[PDB]
Amino acid sequence: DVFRRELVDVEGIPLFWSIAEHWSQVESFEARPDDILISTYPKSGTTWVSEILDLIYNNGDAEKCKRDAIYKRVPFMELIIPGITNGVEMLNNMPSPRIVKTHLPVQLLPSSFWKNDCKIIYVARNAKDVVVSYYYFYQMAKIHPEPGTWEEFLEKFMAGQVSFGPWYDHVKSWWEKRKEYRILYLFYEDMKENPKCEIQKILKFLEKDIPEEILNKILYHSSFSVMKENPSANYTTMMKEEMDHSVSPFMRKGISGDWKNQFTVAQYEKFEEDYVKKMEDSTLKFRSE
Numbered sequence: 121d122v123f124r125r126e127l128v129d130v131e132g133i134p135l136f137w138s139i140a141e142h143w144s145q146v147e148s149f150e151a152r153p154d155d156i157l158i159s160t161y162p163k164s165g166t167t168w169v170s171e172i173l174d175l176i177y178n179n180g181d182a183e184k185c186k187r188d189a190i191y192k193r194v195p196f197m198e199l200i201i202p203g204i205t206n207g208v209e210m211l212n213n214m215p216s217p218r219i220v221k222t223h224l225p226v227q228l229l230p231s232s233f234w235k236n237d238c239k240i241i242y243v244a245r246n247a248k249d250v251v252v253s254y255y256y257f258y259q260m261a262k263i264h265p266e267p268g269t270w271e272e273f274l275e276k277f278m279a280g281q282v283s284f285g286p287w288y289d290h291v292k293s294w295w296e297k298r299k300e301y302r303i304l305y306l307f308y309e310d311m312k313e314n315p316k317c318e319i320q321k322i323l324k325f326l327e328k329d330i331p332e333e334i335l336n337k338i339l340y341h342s343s344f345s346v347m348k349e350n351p352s353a354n355y356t357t358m359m360k361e362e363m364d365h366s367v368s369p370f371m372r373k374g375i376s377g378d379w380k381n382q383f384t385v386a387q388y389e390k391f392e393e394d395y396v397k398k399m400e401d402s403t404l405k406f407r408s409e
């Protein structure tokens with residue numbers, strides 16, 4: 121049973137057993153200078169930005185972006201599950217320009233990305249919304265250990281005892297890294313508020329100037345309501361064994377502020393107190409609504 125196993129520490133970070141088992145393949149991953157790395161803590165907007173990038177790369181052509189599922193168009197690099205997927209191999213076999221997905225904390229990112237000075241788009245999302253999204257994701261995405269109850273999971277998340285480790289360290293270290301490498305550090309909440317502005321930021325970062333009509337096309341097709349229904353983007357093409365959308369759909373709510381629906385007031389206060397301690401010595405700033 122490849123699913124529901126305990127995570128395995130990889131250089132200090134809990135990862136899926138099969139990622140840990142194939143860690144050398146990941147560590148030695150060969151990046152390319154024109155790779156665009158989409159780097160996120162899980163549930164932070166990876167798919168949204170991946171779709172955007174793929175739409176950009178295909179000039180807003182919806183059909184072209186339906187050539188395959190997002191997880192094939194934008195491979196999850198470190199995700200290696202025997203018999204199921206190998207992000208490294210999928211990427212190795214992908215023509216440039218590659219869009220590369222990762223959730224690795226910065227200290228675990230394969231050094232080739234640094235050596236190739238790749239452009240990286242990091243997406244951060246407020247921790248409270250992340251943990252809620254992650255909770256449901258843990259439930260539906262069977263490669264994860266059992267999340268436990270929301271309460272248990274919340275505690276694991278705060279303790280960083282979740283797949284890919286602590287969100288806090290993830291976002292903070294990636295934020296710090298933006299001083300060393302070309303990281304367009306985006307916030308899920310900003311994409312919610314003004315996706316056009318954020319996509320323009322992506323375009324600028326990518327050094328692409330496209331017609332307003334194409335930008336509007338990209339905006340339309342990267343909206344949650346379009347993506348949710350889009351089988352090439354919404355993970356419903358996943359084997360049910362890997363992702364059971366009947367448990368929780370991948371495209372779950374796609375809002376900011378869902379944490380309000382999940383957190384008890386006590387859990388929220390506790391979370392915030394803990395959060396402040398973990399975050400106050402970082403200049404990184406978020407919105408939760």
Ligand SMILES: Nc1ncnc2c1ncn2[C@@H]1O[C@H](COP(=O)(O)OS(=O)(=O)O)[C@@H](OP(=O)(O)O)[C@H]1O
Pocket residue numbers: 160161162163164165166167168249252253254256342343344345347370371372373374375378
């Ligand atoms: N287009 C668009 N607009 C708004 N929100 C979107 C979009 N696409 C994905 N989502 C929401 O992002 C959450 C999934 O995050 P990721 O794509 O990072 O998940 S993953 O780590 O790649 O598995 C998950 O968030 P929650 O809905 O809060 O669970 C998705 O619904």
Ligand SMILES: O=[N+]([O-])c1ccc(OS(=O)(=O)O)cc1
Pocket residue numbers: 191196199204205261262263264362
């Ligand atoms: O390609 N896959 O098989 C795949 C891709 C993503 C994915 O997400 S995960 O967090 O459940 O590993 C799971 C399986």
